Amino acid sequence: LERVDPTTVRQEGPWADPAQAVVQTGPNQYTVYVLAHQWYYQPNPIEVPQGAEIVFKITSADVLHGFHVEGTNINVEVLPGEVSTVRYTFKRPGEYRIICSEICGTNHAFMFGTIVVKE
Ligand code: CUA
């Protein structure tokens, strides 16, 4: 179990700078640091290449959230203080909706993101 401090994740560590969310970690491998908030995803959109292995590293800045990529079997709970890891290779270019699968308050019904898979 991989633990982080939710009260400092916006200020120190790999989720602190939103411009640095996508990091190449092998010839055809990218790690993506996703930070869920009430009520949006950081970064948005997430842009990745077709056929590369993606390693998502997902945590929460406040309350329990969900992270589900429509059209795949990616569906994880996202807890403050914990890192959820998911590995996946996207074979078809195009756009996929990201949906929050855990009730999280006022604007839960509007918490959407996007992943763009480039040709
Ligand atoms: Cu985040 Cu519902």
103 C-beta closer than 6 A to ligand 1: yes
The strand pairing partners of 115, in sequence order, are 46, 96
Smallest CA separation from ligand 1 atom 1, residue: 65
Q: How far is CA 7 from CA 47, 50, 77, in A?
A: 27, 35, 19
Give the H or E element holding residue 23. strand 22-26
In angstroms, what is the resolution? 1.8
- Beta strands (DSSP E) in 27-111 are 29-37, 40-42, 46-49, 53-60, 65-69, 75-78, 84-89, 94-99
Q: Is domain 1-119 given the CATH code 2.60.40.420 in the classification?
A: yes
Q: Is 65 labeled as ligand-binding?
A: yes
Method: X-ray
Q: Where are the alpha helices (DSSP H) in the chain?
A: none
